[PDB]
Structures are given as structure tokens and as C-alpha cells.
């Protein structure tokens, strides 16, 4: 199961975190709730879905109405753990995807603002979160790369350079279809920065005259490779 008849009928029991949790179900596959009391007097409730593809572990506040930490794990290793404040709103939200790329939200304020970060393979980005979208900012000097992730899932990337020399000032355009960020300097294309669907970024340079590309795509591994491109 994901996330590592009788008597009056089925009966099922689960031991999690060195604390035995037992419940009763109807079907003969394992779909049912698992109530369980803690030693610290908290309440732990574990749920197994009908198609056995999504667990829902929740922690409750002794009276079992207020929450502590709901962790919703799925069949493709995708876990979405959340922690809750003293008044019911989400304090932290960690979205571990299928590939292991976590997406951390920390210290969320009451107006929908927090300290976000996307954890990729090899590097750890940073940013913030407003109600509209998540914004991931990678700066180097005067160029500030901005990765806008909406709350609906759309990925858009804007670039801003505060340069003044039109020979060295750097612009960038976006094609949501190609998912490529085309950078331009002095009316001459310099490189592409593709954000692959599998939570990775690829750099590929154009030739010195901006006609077509050169070499192959480079899977970024360190954070300084992004800044190197800026």
C-alpha cells in the first residue's frame, strides 16, 4: 500500500510510527478508516482509498476536530503533507512529486504569502508565493529570472534586466507551446533556457550570429549553472 466478514460484518489494523491503529471496513481489499489514539492524547486517523491508490493520514487535536498535520500520499509516490496553525489555516505545504522534486512552502502568513522553494535534482531554488501565482526568482547582477507558477499549474517564465547599454542589455521572450525561454542581447539571440516537463532546466546556446542553435541541451545540476547563463 502507498506511503510505505466479521464480527458484525471486514476488520483491519495498521501500525504506524510505533502506534497501533485499528478500524473496521466493508470491502475485502483494505478500503477503510484507521482510528487511533496517541500517548500524548492526540488523535491519528488513517484512510485508505477505494481503488487503493491514495492514503490520507491525518493528525488531530484531542477532540479530533482541529488538525495538526494532514499528509495525503498517493500511488505514484506523490505526497502532499500540510501542517496547520492554531486557527485552521495551512502553515506549511510540502508537495513531493512522483520524481522526488519537493516544493516547500514555509511560514505562510494569514493573507496568502509565504517563503517558497522548488527542490530540483542538484539545486534548490527560492522565491515567494502570492495569491495569484508562485514566483521563483534567480538573480545574477542586474538580470533577475522569474519563474511564475500559477495556482492552476501553468508555468510562465519572465526575465528582467536593469541594464542600460542596448549592446549589453538582455531581453527574453516566451513560447508556452515550446516551453522555451528565448534570450536576446543586442538584437541577437544568445541561448535557450527550456524548462522540461520533468522538473529540469536545459541551456542551449545559439551561434555567434543568432541564426540557429549549437551543441546540445545541458541538464542543469548546480545552481551556479543558471547564474552562469545570466
Amino acid at each position, epitope marked *: 500500500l502507498p506511503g510505505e466478514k466479521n464480527k458484525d460484518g471486514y476488520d483491519l489494523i495498521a501500525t504506524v510510527d510505533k502506534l497501533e491503529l485499528k478500524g473496521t471496513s466493508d470491502k475485502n481489499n483494505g478500503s477503510g*478508516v484507521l482510528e487511533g489514539v496517541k500517548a500524548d492524547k492526540s488523535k491519528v*486517523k488513517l484512510t485508505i482509498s477505494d481503488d487503493l491508490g491514495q492514503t490520507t493520514l491525518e493528525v488531530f487535536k484531542e477532540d*479530533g*476536530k482541529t488538525l495538526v498535520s494532514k499528509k495525503v500520499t498517493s500511488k505514484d509516490k506523490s505526497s502532499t503533507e500540510e501542517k496547520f496553525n492554531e*486557527k*485552521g*489555516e495551512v502553515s506549511e505545504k510540502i508537495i513531493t512529486r512522483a520524481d522526488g522534486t519537493r516544493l516547500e512552502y514555509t511560514g505562510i502568513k*494569514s493573507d496568502g504569502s509565504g517563503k517558497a522553494k522548488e527542490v530540483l535534482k542538484g539545486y534548490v531554488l527560492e522565491g515567494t508565493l502570492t495569491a495569484e501565482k508562485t514566483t521563483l526568482v534567480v538573480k545574477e547582477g542586474t538580470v533577475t529570472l522569474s519563474k511564475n507558477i500559477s495556482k492552476s499549474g501553468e508555468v510562465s517564465v519572465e526575465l528582467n534586466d536593469t541594464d542600460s547599454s542596448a549592446a549589453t542589455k538582455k531581453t527574453a521572450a516566451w513560447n508556452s507551446g515550446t516551453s522555451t525561454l528565448t534570450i536576446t542581447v543586442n538584437s541577437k539571440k544568445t541561448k535557450d533556457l527550456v524548462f522540461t516537463k520533468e522538473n529540469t532546466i536545459t541551456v542551449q546556446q545559439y551561434d555567434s550570429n543568432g541564426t540557429k542553435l549549437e551543441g546540445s541541451a545541458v541538464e542543469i545540476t548546480k545552481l551556479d549553472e543558471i547564474k552562469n547563463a545570466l
Partner: antibody
Amino acid sequence: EVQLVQSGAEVKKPGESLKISCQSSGYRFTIYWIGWVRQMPGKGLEWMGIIWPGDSDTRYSPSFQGQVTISADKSISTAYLQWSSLKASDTAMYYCVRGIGRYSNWFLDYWGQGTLVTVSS
Amino acid sequence: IQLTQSPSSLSASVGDRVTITCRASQGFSSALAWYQQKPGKAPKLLIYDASSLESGVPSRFSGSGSGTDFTLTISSLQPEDFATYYCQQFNSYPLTFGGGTKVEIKR
């Protein structure tokens, strides 16, 4: 042992302000939301607003924003529903409710016995 | 979010198994609650998170649903279960309630 004692029933006339209170007890007053829910006669349950004591985090429903004032005095474990220039269209039953927090919202696990506000000349 | 709650009137005998339906204008998962307003008194919370029974109500009350249709269920109707039953949404601001469902006991 969680109880909610509300103000007695009130008669008013269109033009008067009105304050009604609800006295929570049995739990830690400064950790659970308290709000007000309206039940128009014949009509269903309408939600007015809610507040979190104590930091006075007040949240209202658009159908009532600017029409009502909700407060809570944590020194006496008491929430207030407050008007000014009552209308006859405000005649309903008002329940102080204790709220349990969900994502930016609540359900209501405890309800007061109700305060009936009649507004006629 | 409009909340259509059906049926409106309902009669059944003691021991039956009745099912109320709450139909939401928008879809969600496990973000609805059930209340029992007995005559003269105030609403009492029956079901929270659409599947969790609150300690203090009998075991015969149950509720389930997902998507756009929800359901509250009574395993063995009793003459004290005579009341009106409401469904409340806490998915989207602001909160809403269903039109109500009267439950009559046949005798």
C-alpha cells in the same frame, strides 16, 4: 461541558442600533473561532461573519460586509453582534457558533440557543 | 456555491434507512457538514468533513459523498430523529447551507 449562552430576545424599530452578546464557556475561549449565523424565518441558514479571539482577526461574508460589526472581548469570553440603523429586513434568529478551522474556512460544531431580533414599528 | 438539498418532505417508519442528498453547484472532496435542527432547539452538528462522526451523536448516523453529490444516511430510523437536516459547504468563501430537509416519522 462546552456551553454558549446568548442574549435575550430583542424588539427594536427601524433606526436603532443593537448589540447582542454570547457568553462562551467550557473551552479555551482564545483558541476557537466564534461567529454569527442568521436564520431568516421561512428562509434557510445565512452566514454573517466570524472572528478569532484573541487577536481580533475578523472575517465577514460579502452579503453582510459593511452592514454589521462582529467583535469579541477575550477578557470576558464574550462575542458581540452589532448593528446600526436596523431594518425590518434584519428580523431573524441569530446563533453564535463555535468554528473549527479548515482551509480558509470553517464548519460549526457548537451553536448557541439563538437570539430572536424583531424589528417593527 | 448554490446548495440544492433534496428531498424536501420525507416520511418513513421506525427502523427504515433514509438517505438525504445534497447537490453542490461546484465540485470538491470532503468539504461538507451535516446538521440536525430539532424543533424549537438549535442546529446540532452531525457529520463533519462529510465522513467523520462527531462523538456525542449515535452510531446510526453516517454520511458520504464526493464530487457534486453528497449523502447523509441513517441506519435505523428512530422517532427522536425527527428534525430538519441541513448540509453546509466550507469549500469556497463564503459558507452556504442547503434549503433543508424535513424528516417525518410514520406511525
